[PDB]
Ligand binder design. Sequence first.
Ligand SMILES: [Mg+2]
Length: 684
Amino acid sequence: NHLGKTEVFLNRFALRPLNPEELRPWRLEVVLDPPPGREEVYPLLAQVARRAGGVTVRMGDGLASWSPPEVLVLEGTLARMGQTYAYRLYPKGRRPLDPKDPGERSVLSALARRLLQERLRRLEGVWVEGLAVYRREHARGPGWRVLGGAVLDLWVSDSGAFLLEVDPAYRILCEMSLEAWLAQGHPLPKRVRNAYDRRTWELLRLGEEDPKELPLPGGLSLLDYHASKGRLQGREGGRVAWVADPKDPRKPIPHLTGLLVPVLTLEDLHEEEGSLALSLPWEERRRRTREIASWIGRRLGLGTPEAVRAQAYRLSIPKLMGRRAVSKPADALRVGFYRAQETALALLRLDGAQGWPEFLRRALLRAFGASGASLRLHTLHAHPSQGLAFREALRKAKEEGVQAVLVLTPPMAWEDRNRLKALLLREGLPSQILNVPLREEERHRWENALLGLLAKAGLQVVALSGAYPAELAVGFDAGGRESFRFGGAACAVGGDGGHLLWTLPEAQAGERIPQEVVWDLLEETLWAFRRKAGRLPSRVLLLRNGRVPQDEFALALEALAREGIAYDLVSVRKSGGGRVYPVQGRLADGLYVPLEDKTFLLLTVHRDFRGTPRPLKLVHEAGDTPLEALAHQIFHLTRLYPASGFAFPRLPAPLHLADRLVKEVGRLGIRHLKEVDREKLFFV
DNA sequence: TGAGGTAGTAGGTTGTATAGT
RNA sequence: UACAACCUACUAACCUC
Ligand SMILES: [Mg+2]
């Protein structure tokens, strides 16, 4: 191996192997009347396990248990969606389960988790939300405190052992009223909860009215209203507070500040504490992870926790290329781009002012100078409020070779931002916005805005230097919408990643991307590779954001086999990787950690040393490229994103682009994209 | 809208098996 | 439901370049 080995700890701990009585759970038969539906079987079975109590989990069509039937509610009644059923439990003995059998250890682990939860529920000083445990004051001020603990998990090995997952976690509690909060000179919090229940509102403003005078729609005083329900007992109705239901933050509602409690944010605390942060340096997290794990092991009698370790790998550093070797995409602004064509940019200024800021102009001229490419800056002399007659100023601009526009503007309301984006997109003109109180020392901002303006004009700013198995990398994501998704793809064309492009996403009902939309988009990207390389990819790298729905790539994978194209399919989850800590030494990004076959973690980015990194968890779902070669290429693709400039995304450029793309399309809509070259990354 | 990201609180989504015969 | 993978608002926050 040409890669440097390192050992790592996972945030998992090995515990004792299950004993006989744990391997052979009480079985039970479930007799539900009226007999269940089909989509309603498991949900009711689970609500029966929960209604029977003890360490009980559903198992198949009946239930498993680590509790004696003599402490189980064997007869009962539960109310599901509309219908009221009655259940009965028939102790079918005690069959043993086998940890190798996937759904059997699925049951063993289910029971482990329920056990852990019950052991936790009985602990005295601790606060326990589900599997989260908070046990120690971490910070505090007048009226508030922050509790520290950890989220946990207990499951069963393939080899019959208990497994503990631990990750330090915090909870912010405010137990003071709004009145006191505001009386200590702090600012209004954006959200606020009822003091007498969980109902939570957005806090609009404070009221000038008198509680005892404010007539409540159909009845009494604000004060008299609340008094009625006995809420002023042991409390002091404060001032008038106008709040709103977050679902429709229009219609204001009267409330009293003595009966509201602030919902706090880290910044509401930064007014007080200032030096309080909730993320941890990785070594601190590792330490507390170990302490808490030992603490639980000691409250659990499942042995002494032995931190599980894995073999990690230092991946080769990606060689990023501008015109010359580069270390971050912003450096391309000084050295030149990987491949720059002739370009024409336009300016839309929407403050009172006029013309290109000289430093931007010079930065651009230098970059194209350095790149050995011609540049022609234009300036739109028209305003959006000229209604549509400015579309014609837009018409002019496309008839001279303008590939993208800079909008120099005051901060825009989201609505107007979209209105404008759309408006310029109709004419196939991607826009980069730059907020206009702007000064040359705000360098990372205008240089990122510039890098984005350039990606949006179709320039390739950086590429990789290296030989990778796949000559085509395409990432698939689903949706930038609520009740339905979009599902689209983006593209790193060439082994150098010499080209990036996007594909029009297609409206769909949920996560799963229709098999045929998958193959369609893929085909679009095959056409791209073909028409710039004159040949078909020998191998493609297929990437999904998140879990991959059952055989949703099947049609496309078969289409690929047919056309004699080799391929790999990787599922890239942002969650589920847990944690990774060096046994010795520092931790740098580029970490590759094999877990089972078909799966591995990748610590792709580390940079904000006040926080702890979250490895991606990746599953090799199809294909037969060595795990290490996939890791290597994913890792390098992380560095290919043009629009970030000073920090790399945690996701590989195609998946990060696909994400940005379906969020933009979900935001602006799908219309107005007919006239946009797919090489202009309009959405970064 | 500069961009990347770790941490919170409060409120949401889809995806899987699940029978009958 | 849990489990699994996610989204939104607070967040143009906070930290970092
Ligand atoms: Mg952008």
